[PDB]
Amino acid sequence: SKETEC
Amino acid sequence: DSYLVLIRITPDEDGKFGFNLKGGVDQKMPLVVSRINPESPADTCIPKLNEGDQIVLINGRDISEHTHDQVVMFIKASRESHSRELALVIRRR
Ligand code: NA
Ligand code: NA
Numbered sequence A: 001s002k003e004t005e006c
Numbered sequence B: 001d002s003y004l005v006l007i008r009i010t011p012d013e014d015g016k017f018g019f020n021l022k023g024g025v026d027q028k029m030p031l032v033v034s035r036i037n038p039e040s041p042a043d044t045c046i047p048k049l050n051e052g053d054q055i056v057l058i059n060g061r062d063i064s065e066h067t068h069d070q071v072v073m074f075i076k077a078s079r080e081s082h083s084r085e086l087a088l089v090i091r092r093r
Helices: B068-077
Strands: A003-005 B003-009 B019-024 B029-036 B054-058 B086-092
Touching (some): B019 B068, B029 B054
Antiparallel strands (some): A003 B019
C-alpha cells in the first residue's frame, strides 16, 4: 500500500 | 457536487512539491493526495492542493491507467520541466 513523498 | 481544479506548483529548493500521493492502477485505488506538508509550495499556491484531492491530469496527461511508480516519475519529470512547474487537474468534492 504505497505512499510517496512528492 | 464534485468539481475540477487546476493547481500549479513550483518545487522548493530540495525538489519537493510538499505532498504525498497514494493509489495508481497497481494499487487498485485511485490516485489521491494523502498529505499536504504545511507551508510547502502545494499548500501555498493559489489555488492550493488539498488532502483528499483526486489526481485527474498531470501536465495534461490522463494518468488513470498508470502505476503509482509511473505517476511519481511524471511528477518528478516536471522539475526538469520547461516552466519547472507542475500542473495538476484534480477533482474535489
Ligand atoms: Na484555494
Ligand atoms: Na494538468
